[PDB]
Write an enzyme that holds these catalytic residues in place. Structure first.
Site, PDB file in Angstrom:
ATOM      1  N   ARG A   1     -23.402 -30.743  28.116  1.00  0.00           N
ATOM      2  CA  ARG A   1     -23.742 -31.918  27.419  1.00  0.00           C
ATOM      3  C   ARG A   1     -23.281 -33.187  27.856  1.00  0.00           C
ATOM      4  NH1 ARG A   1     -19.391 -29.499  24.802  1.00  0.00           N
ATOM      5  NH2 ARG A   1     -17.567 -30.920  24.612  1.00  0.00           N
ATOM      6  N   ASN A   2     -22.168 -33.256  28.803  1.00  0.00           N
ATOM      7  CA  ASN A   2     -21.578 -34.472  29.527  1.00  0.00           C
ATOM      8  C   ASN A   2     -22.358 -34.420  30.795  1.00  0.00           C
ATOM      9  OD1 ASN A   2     -20.186 -35.815  27.509  1.00  0.00           O
ATOM     10  ND2 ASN A   2     -18.512 -34.551  27.703  1.00  0.00           N
TER      11      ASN A   2
ATOM     12  N   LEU B   1     -32.216 -44.625  23.346  1.00  0.00           N
ATOM     13  CA  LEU B   1     -32.397 -43.063  24.120  1.00  0.00           C
ATOM     14  C   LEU B   1     -31.159 -42.340  23.126  1.00  0.00           C
ATOM     15  CD1 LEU B   1     -32.159 -43.852  27.769  1.00  0.00           C
ATOM     16  CD2 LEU B   1     -33.949 -42.803  26.540  1.00  0.00           C
TER      17      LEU B   1
ATOM     18  N   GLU C   1     -27.557 -42.512  20.120  1.00  0.00           N
ATOM     19  CA  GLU C   1     -26.336 -43.085  19.601  1.00  0.00           C
ATOM     20  C   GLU C   1     -25.200 -42.179  19.059  1.00  0.00           C
ATOM     21  OE1 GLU C   1     -28.733 -44.366  15.003  1.00  0.00           O
ATOM     22  OE2 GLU C   1     -26.698 -44.973  15.579  1.00  0.00           O
TER      23      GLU C   1
ATOM     24  N   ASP D   1     -13.158 -33.226  29.676  1.00  0.00           N
ATOM     25  CA  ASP D   1     -14.367 -32.676  28.725  1.00  0.00           C
ATOM     26  C   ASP D   1     -15.542 -32.360  29.296  1.00  0.00           C
ATOM     27  OD1 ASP D   1     -15.577 -32.319  26.022  1.00  0.00           O
ATOM     28  OD2 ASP D   1     -16.375 -34.303  26.177  1.00  0.00           O
TER      29      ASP D   1
ATOM     30  N   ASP E   1     -20.065 -38.608  30.715  1.00  0.00           N
ATOM     31  CA  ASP E   1     -19.300 -38.538  29.688  1.00  0.00           C
ATOM     32  C   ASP E   1     -19.599 -39.306  28.425  1.00  0.00           C
ATOM     33  OD1 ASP E   1     -17.013 -37.841  27.935  1.00  0.00           O
ATOM     34  OD2 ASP E   1     -15.561 -39.216  28.944  1.00  0.00           O
TER      35      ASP E   1
HETATM   36  C1  LIG Z   1     -33.081 -38.116  24.693  1.00  0.00           C
HETATM   37  N1  LIG Z   1     -32.612 -38.651  25.868  1.00  0.00           N
HETATM   38  C2  LIG Z   1     -33.143 -39.040  27.440  1.00  0.00           C
HETATM   39  N2  LIG Z   1     -32.481 -39.532  28.101  1.00  0.00           N
HETATM   40  C3  LIG Z   1     -31.237 -39.675  27.296  1.00  0.00           C
HETATM   41  C4  LIG Z   1     -29.872 -40.512  27.884  1.00  0.00           C
HETATM   42  C5  LIG Z   1     -28.815 -40.586  27.193  1.00  0.00           C
HETATM   43  N3  LIG Z   1     -27.829 -41.476  27.702  1.00  0.00           N
HETATM   44  C6  LIG Z   1     -28.003 -41.787  28.985  1.00  0.00           C
HETATM   45  O1  LIG Z   1     -27.011 -42.528  29.560  1.00  0.00           O
HETATM   46  C7  LIG Z   1     -25.651 -42.469  29.023  1.00  0.00           C
HETATM   47  C8  LIG Z   1     -25.116 -41.144  29.363  1.00  0.00           C
HETATM   48  C9  LIG Z   1     -23.604 -40.866  29.074  1.00  0.00           C
HETATM   49  N4  LIG Z   1     -22.840 -42.056  29.960  1.00  0.00           N
HETATM   50  C10 LIG Z   1     -21.953 -41.625  30.863  1.00  0.00           C
HETATM   51  O2  LIG Z   1     -21.842 -40.599  31.226  1.00  0.00           O
HETATM   52  C11 LIG Z   1     -21.073 -42.663  31.500  1.00  0.00           C
HETATM   53  C12 LIG Z   1     -20.082 -42.098  32.458  1.00  0.00           C
HETATM   54  C13 LIG Z   1     -19.134 -41.890  31.901  1.00  0.00           C
HETATM   55  C14 LIG Z   1     -17.971 -41.188  32.876  1.00  0.00           C
HETATM   56  C15 LIG Z   1     -18.255 -40.997  33.977  1.00  0.00           C
HETATM   57  O3  LIG Z   1     -17.291 -40.334  35.090  1.00  0.00           O
HETATM   58  C16 LIG Z   1     -17.214 -38.989  35.001  1.00  0.00           C
HETATM   59  F1  LIG Z   1     -16.712 -38.722  33.718  1.00  0.00           F
HETATM   60  F2  LIG Z   1     -18.322 -38.346  35.225  1.00  0.00           F
HETATM   61  F3  LIG Z   1     -16.437 -39.024  35.982  1.00  0.00           F
HETATM   62  C17 LIG Z   1     -19.597 -41.395  34.646  1.00  0.00           C
HETATM   63  C18 LIG Z   1     -20.330 -41.970  33.756  1.00  0.00           C
HETATM   64  C19 LIG Z   1     -23.022 -43.416  29.610  1.00  0.00           C
HETATM   65  C20 LIG Z   1     -24.807 -43.572  29.776  1.00  0.00           C
HETATM   66  F4  LIG Z   1     -25.129 -43.368  31.030  1.00  0.00           F
HETATM   67  C21 LIG Z   1     -28.910 -41.459  29.913  1.00  0.00           C
HETATM   68  C22 LIG Z   1     -29.363 -42.034  31.290  1.00  0.00           C
HETATM   69  N5  LIG Z   1     -27.971 -41.998  32.035  1.00  0.00           N
HETATM   70  O4  LIG Z   1     -30.236 -42.688  31.410  1.00  0.00           O
HETATM   71  C23 LIG Z   1     -30.031 -40.942  29.146  1.00  0.00           C
HETATM   72  C24 LIG Z   1     -31.439 -39.171  26.047  1.00  0.00           C
END
Ligand SMILES: Cn1cnc(-c2cnc(O[C@H]3CCN(C(=O)Cc4ccc(OC(F)(F)F)cc4)C[C@H]3F)c(C(N)=O)c2)c1
Length: 272
Positions: free
Chosen positions: A141-142, A16, A18, A137, A155
């Site tokens: 975007r987050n 998805l 990097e 942050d 995040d």
């Molecule tokens: C083109 N495209 C289409 N879909 C995508 C996609 C890309 N990445 C994803 O998952 C990633 C997104 C970022 N991530 C966090 O956010 C963790 C996290 C940090 C901190 C927090 O706590 C806080 F800060 F919010 F309090 C909670 C949670 C890790 C992970 F999940 C998902 C997808 N999730 O399916 C979907 C890309």
């Protein structure tokens, strides 16, 4: 206690995204939820395996386990069967909120939808503030977008930071003194509000990183977006008081946004 997932329960399907940290994959996870034999999930694989990173990983996993709310992206567990170290999250199909805003902007989202988006981000921030958690942050975007415009706060970890900080979302005390508080998070939400009603435009787009720093530290406010009713702009300005003690509470900001989310103001971007 952090939940552990067996490696042969996870089936990786597609990358998805990097960054520097490692990679994020769409995957089918088995024996996670009882009614769902196979369900989609987001898998984060970390590049480093060293003890300095391994201890930092478990630390993150522990905090992620402790954060449970409707508008915080769900953390499901870990896979510590050697390298790579896996972190399992729920699947948010539409990706981050910045790309979704730009791609659903000049079908384009309506007043009620943008307010639905904003209130959801405020709900998650209220939860965070309650635990004395400072995000540091907060930005579109987050945030992540799932099925049926469901918005959660996450995040990740490019040209959005100066040397590195998301200065454009940061208030003066965070730029000048590097002090991140619950109050600095309110300022950020105010910028997240601007981003929502501009369909993901970068705050101070007509300025450079260095120029914007001088613009924020002098107390200049972002202009009212075309699609933004003046009721919402008042909410943003209240998030942007030079004095942190004079900035509104997120509990209050949410309450006002929720009122508009249920009773949408009779506004049209065209007339102003
Ligand atoms: C083109 N495209 C289409 N879909 C995508 C996609 C890309 N990445 C994803 O998952 C990633 C997104 C970022 N991530 C966090 O956010 C963790 C996290 C940090 C901190 C927090 O706590 C806080 F800060 F919010 F309090 C909670 C949670 C890790 C992970 F999940 C998902 C997808 N999730 O399916 C979907 C890309």
């Amino acid at each position: 206690c952090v939940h552990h997932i067996k490696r042969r329960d996870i089936v990786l399907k597609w990358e998805l995204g990097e960054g520097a940290f490692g990679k994020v994959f769409l995957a089918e996870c088995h024996n996670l939820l009882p009614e769902q034999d196979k369900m989609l999930v987001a898998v984060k694989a970390l590049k480093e395996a060293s003890e300095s990173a391994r201890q930092d990983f478990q630390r993150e996993a522990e905090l992620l386990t402790m954060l449970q709310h409707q508008h915080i992206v769900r953390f499901f567990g870990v896979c510590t069967e050697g390298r790579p170290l896996l972190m399992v999250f729920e699947y948010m199909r539409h990706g981050d909120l910045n790309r979704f805003l730009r791609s659903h902007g000049p079908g384009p989202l309506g007043l009620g939808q943008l307010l639905a988006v904003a209130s959801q981000v405020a709900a998650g921030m209220v939860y965070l503030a309650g635990l004395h958690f400072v995000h540091r942050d907060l930005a579109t975007r987050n945030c992540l977008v799932g099925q049926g415009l469901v918005v959660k706060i996450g995040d990740f970890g490019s040209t959005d930071y100066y040397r590195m900080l998301p200065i454009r979302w940061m208030p003066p005390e965070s730029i000048l003194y590097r002090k991140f508080t619950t109050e600095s998070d309110v300022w950020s939400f105010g910028v997240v509000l601007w981003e929502i009603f501009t369909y993901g435009k970068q705050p101070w787009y007509q300025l450079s990183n260095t120029e914007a720093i001088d613009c924020i530290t002098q107390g200049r406010e972002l202009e009212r977006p075309r699609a933004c009713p003046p009721e919402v702009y008042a909410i943003m300005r209240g998030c942007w008081q030079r004095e942190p003690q004079q900035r509104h509470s997120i509990k209050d900001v949410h309450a006002r946004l929720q009122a508009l989310a249920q009773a949408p103001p009779v506004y049209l971007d065209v007339l102003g």
